[PDB]
Design a protein around this nucleic acid. Structure first.
Length: 54
RNA sequence: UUUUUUUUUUUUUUUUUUUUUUUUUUCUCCUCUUUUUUUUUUUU
């Protein structure tokens, strides 16, 4: 919140919705693990994690 | 190459009182033998 930490590593517990967005967001993978079907992401998810950068 | 969420030890306290040991039965009941009754007295 105070900007004293630069690089953050977080799972979906912090991804899909937050206020106070930083400037840049990066993705290290294309897939995700839902409840034992091992699907990929959908636009409803990509909008929320990546829709908060400004 | 396996993420996200599912609360926990019932609330209450700042009510008066002018009595006194016990406690409640048992029925009428043939007394055998020398006597009048002796007696002063003195030594404690």
């Amino acid at each position: 919140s105070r900007g004293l930490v630069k690089v953050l590593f977080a799972t979906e517990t912090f991804a899909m919705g937050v206020n106070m967005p930083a400037r840049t967001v990066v993705f290290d993978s294309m897939r995700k693990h839902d409840g034992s079907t091992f699907r990929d992401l959908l636009p409803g998810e990509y909008v929320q994690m990546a829709g908060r950068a400004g």
